[PDB]
Amino acid sequence: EADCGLRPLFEKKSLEDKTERELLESYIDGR
Amino acid sequence: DFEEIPEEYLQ
Amino acid sequence: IVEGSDAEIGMSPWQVMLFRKSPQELLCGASLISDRWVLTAAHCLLYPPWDKNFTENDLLVRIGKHSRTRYERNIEKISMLEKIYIHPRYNWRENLDRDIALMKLKKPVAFSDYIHPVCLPDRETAASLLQAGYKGRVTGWGNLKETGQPSVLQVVNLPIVERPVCKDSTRIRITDNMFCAGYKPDEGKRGDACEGDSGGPFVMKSPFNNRWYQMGIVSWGEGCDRDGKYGFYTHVFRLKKWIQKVIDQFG
Ligand SMILES: N[C@@H](C(=O)N1CCC[C@H]1C(=O)NCc1ccncc1)C(c1ccccc1)c1ccccc1
Ligand SMILES: *[C@@H]1O[C@H](CO)[C@@H](O)[C@H](O)[C@H]1NC(C)=O
Ligand code: NA
Ligand code: NA
Numbered sequence: 178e179a180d181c182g183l184r185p186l187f188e189k190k191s192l193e194d195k196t197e198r199e200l201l202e203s204y205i206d207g208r
Numbered sequence: 209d210f211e212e213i214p215e216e217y218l219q
Numbered sequence: 220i221v222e223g224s225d226a227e228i229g230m231s232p233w234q235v236m237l238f239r240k241s242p243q244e245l246l247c248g249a250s251l252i253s254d255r256w257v258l259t260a261a262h263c264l265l266y267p268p269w270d271k272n273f274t275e276n277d278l279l280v281r282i283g284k285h286s287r288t289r290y291e292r293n294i295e296k297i298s299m300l301e302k303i304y305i306h307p308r309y310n311w312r313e314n315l316d317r318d319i320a321l322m323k324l325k326k327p328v329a330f331s332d333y334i335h336p337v338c339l340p341d342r343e344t345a346a347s348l349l350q351a352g353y354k355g356r357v358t359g360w361g362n363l364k365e366t367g368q369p370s371v372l373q374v375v376n377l378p379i380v381e382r383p384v385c386k387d388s389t390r391i392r393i394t395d396n397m398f399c400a401g402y403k404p405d406e407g408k409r410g411d412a413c414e415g416d417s418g419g420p421f422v423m424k425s426p427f428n429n430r431w432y433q434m435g436i437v438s439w440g441e442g443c444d445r446d447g448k449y450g451f452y453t454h455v456f457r458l459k460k461w462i463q464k465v466i467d468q469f470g
Pocket of ligand 3: 386387388389390391
């Protein structure tokens with residue numbers, strides 16, 4: 178879907194869940 | 209220990 | 220999920236519960252990839268060593284759930300299966316190679332705050348994110364310990380492990396259609412999938428476009444959360460050509 182992977186209660190309202198930052202901090206590629 | 213689901217789904 | 224935590228509401232809106240009709244019980248996890256298609260592990264549906272061979276009418280899929288056992292009125296949606304598709308080269312005899320299956324629903328499920336599909340990776344997203352040390356997220360209603368069961372959906376974030384370390388941890392023959400994840404004994408964090416979490420998603424949030432991608436399917440392990448053991452996941456991108464072939468032919 179064009180809208181896949183975007184959560185109504187998080188990405189769609191620009192709210193972060195409590196641990197997604199842990200994932201981001203592990204992603205070195207491309208920063 | 210599961211709550212019964214509506215009968216329509218088991219039809 | 221061992222050594223995880225309670226999910227937040229709407230944290231994993233692609234989560235699917237595969238539910239056995241009789242006896243009423245959790246069969247496996249799964250994930251929503253469109254309004255008509257659910258992805259799971261083949262061994263959730265077919266595993267002859269354990270006399271497991273489910274047909275469509277044996278099962279329901281329950282979407283939008285948080286509580287394990289409650290009927291979540293006005294929130295969850297319960298769908299019937301039209302057809303099961305198991306990978307034609309799923310190796311249940313040896314090592315669960317190509318542990319992947321699709322289910323087409325009889326009717327489209329309505330999206331909501333609690334129900335929304337995950338993306339499947341492209342080659343570039345897979346190449347970028349499937350790297351040792353990069354963390355993904357595993358969710359499920361499976362056992363809390365190897366040797367009880369959760370009130371609500373559990374979540375744990377785990378790092379992908381170097382392939383030689385995966386190989387050296389096990390006597391099972393690993394293939395390119397698998398990857399493994401988990402902390403090492405030294406690392407001082409733990410966590411794992413366990414029985415009942417099979418078929419659920421290992422997801423990663425792309426830092427390029429801020430979308431969640433399903434990179435893996437909970438497949439197998441030796442125990443749960445054992446030091447020096449790792450969880451093994453079906454490599455979704457490596458099997459995507461099959462996924463697309465099924466959906467193009469039958470969708
Ligand atoms: N423990 C076995 C396993 O995971 N098997 C058996 C068939 C189904 C799946 C399962 O329960 N998957 C769910 C799972 C279990 C533990 N953590 C995470 C998910 C495994 C094995 C791998 C591949 C093929 C056969 C068996 C195993 C590994 C080493 C020694 C013996 C068995
Ligand atoms: C699984 O069950 C189906 C349904 O009858 C059957 O056609 C198939 O041969 C079975 N496969 C195995 C490996 O038992
Ligand atoms: Na080995
Ligand atoms: Na471990």
